[PDB]
Amino acid sequence: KSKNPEDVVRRYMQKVKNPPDEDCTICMERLVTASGYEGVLRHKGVRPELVGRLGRCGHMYHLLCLVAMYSNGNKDGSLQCPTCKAIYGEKTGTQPPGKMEFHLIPHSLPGFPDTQTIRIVYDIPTGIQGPEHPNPGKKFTARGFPRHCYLPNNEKGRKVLRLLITAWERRLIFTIGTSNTTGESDTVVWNEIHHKTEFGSNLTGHGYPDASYLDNVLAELTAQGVSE
Ligand SMILES: NC(=O)c1ccc[n+]([C@@H]2O[C@H](COP(=O)([O-])OP(=O)(O)OC[C@H]3O[C@@H](n4cnc5c(N)ncnc54)[C@H](O)[C@@H]3O)[C@@H](O)[C@H]2O)c1
Ligand SMILES: [Zn+2]
Ligand SMILES: [Zn+2]
């Protein structure tokens, strides 16, 4: 679905014909007068007097104000109510094309005796940045692929796997930007969902044992809108 500010906001806002004489808590003008936003998106945009009720919570704003607020964020397809902090829509990312594969291997991770291991492989080729990327039309590099990572095959690890698959489909596992490890720009980097790439030790900090990891990555997934 379109992630553009006007389309996203219009998707979740229900028109109010007779708004009350109360403050829009985005622009702090009354809902019965024009939006206080005067930036570039007002020109030939949403009529400034239009007011809507947002999503399930029903909080009311000038439509133009929520368009501006959404535009000043990540524009990831999710829309947060500034009053009650409920989030509407599905957060998706800018991960480029590639493949995600997984299967079981007959080896136990440190701290998970008597288990098999879910081995996940991500493979992302180089390509051309799209309009969603920092430098559209410029090449992006993809270093160190295929990238292997590991989860124990237990109840919680399988839950994490299910959610990682969802995050992958929502283009949230990788992004295009600058590597904090190499300094290279215009390159495919891990996003904000940590993966364990070191199997039998934790000298890198990205390995095992780590008794907190599964709960930590579940929290990271929830923060990116990926929950069960
Ligand atoms: N030519 C190469 O072999 C080459 C070059 C660059 C990166 N890489 C691979 O990518 C890693 C660097 O990460 P990046 O450039 O994508 O993003 P990054 O360095 O900008 O870090 C982004 C996120 O990924 C985490 N992260 C960093 N290294 C990780 C690792 N080995 N395993 C799991 N998570 C890691 C970070 O904590 C952070 O949360 C390298 O360690 C390597 O595995 C390989
Ligand atoms: Zn307003
Ligand atoms: Zn609300």
Swiss-Prot record:
Positions of RING-type zinc fingers: 24-85
PTM note: Ubiquitinated; undergoes 'Lys-29'-linked polyubiquitination catalyzed by ITCH.
Keywords: Cytoplasm, Metal-binding, Notch signaling pathway, Nucleus, Repeat, SH3-binding, Transferase, Ubl conjugation, Zinc, Zinc-finger
Main location: cytoplasm
Described purpose of this protein according to its UniProt entry: Functions as a ubiquitin ligase protein in vivo, mediating ubiquitination and promoting degradation of MEKK1, suggesting that it may regulate the Notch pathway via some ubiquitin ligase activity. Regulator of Notch signaling, a signaling pathway involved in cell-cell communications that regulates a broad spectrum of cell-fate determinations. Mainly acts as a positive regulator of Notch, but it also acts as a negative regulator, depending on the developmental and cell context. Mediates the antineural activity of Notch, possibly by inhibiting the transcriptional activation mediated by MATCH1.
Sequence similarity: Belongs to the Deltex family.
Subunit architecture: Homodimer. May form a heterodimer with other members of the Deltex family. Interacts with NOTCH1 via its N-terminal region and EIF3F, the interaction is required for NOTCH1 deubiquitination. Interacts with EP300. Forms a heterodimer with BBAP; the heterodimerization leading to an increase of in vitro ubiquitin ligase activity. Interacts with ITCH.
The protein, known as: E3 ubiquitin-protein ligase DTX1
Gene source species: Homo sapiens (Human)
Organism ancestry: Eukaryota, Metazoa, Chordata, Craniata, Vertebrata
Parent-record interval covered: 388 to 615 of 620
